[PDB]
Amino acid sequence: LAAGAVILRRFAFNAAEQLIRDINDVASQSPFRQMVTPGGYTMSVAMTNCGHLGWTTHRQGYLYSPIDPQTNKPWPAMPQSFHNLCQRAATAAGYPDFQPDACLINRYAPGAKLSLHQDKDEPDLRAPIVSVSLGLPAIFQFGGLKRNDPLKRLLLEHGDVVVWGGESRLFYHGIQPLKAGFHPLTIDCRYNLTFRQAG
């Protein structure tokens, strides 16, 4: 249970193949890189973006930038398949006016994790985040408004779409070490797209 969250399991199953082709297309211009946190530690989750803006780490913290700091080129345009799926997901959730300008693509290798954090770099925290999972299953862990609040678990599998709105939007969250295994479309990893209204 998560207030404001609309869980649409296997919603992106049909679009999955095209999404993976489009991730590889995005990755050819802006490669997956394990971003260095402000404290000097490399993240285990490999990331990249597409859209006008893109999430990245820098010296003084976290920010959205229209430029990829590794390639020094802008982030690739958001694929049509990405726009179409996010629009369908958002509309089904009660947000037909949601128009993302940023999509953070997370790649999880076996054992890759993401510790507890909040997504608060966006200007309007009332605007939801559309999460699309592809490939190997992962355990999404979440608390509440505070970091010491009781942790709940949710498995996110291939094609699972969640629209994190309302209270759920501000929840402290993370991903547990990705269990090893096989998936027909991604081989040995998990991909996660998080559409954001960043401008």
Q: Is 25 annotated as a binding residue?
A: no
122 binds Fe ion (CB under 5 A): no
Query: What is the Cα–Cα distance from 61 to 98, expressed in whole angstroms?
Result: 27
Q: How many helices (H) and strands (E) does the chain have?
A: 2, 12
Site stretch for Fe ion (CB under 5 A), options 4-12, 25-33, 116-124, 153-161: 116-124
H or E segment to which residue 57 belongs: strand 54-58
User: C-beta of 174: minimal distance to Fe ion in Å?
Assistant: 7
117 labelled binding-site residue: yes
**Is residue 160 at the binding interface for Fe ion, with CB under 5 A as the rule?**
no
Q: Which residue is nearest to Fe ion (CB)?
A: 119
CA-based nearest residue to 98, from 192, 170, 6: 6
Classify 4 in phi/psi space as left (phi over 0), alpha (psi -120 to 50) or beta.
left
**Closest separation in Å from C-beta 138 to Fe ion:** 13
Residue closer to Fe ion (CB basis): 96 or 123: 123
The residues with which 174 forms a beta bridge, in sequence order, are 141
The reply to whether 119 sits near Fe ion by the rule CB under 5 A is yes
| Smallest distance from Fe ion to CB 186, Å | 20
The site for Fe ion (CB under 5 A) is made up of 119
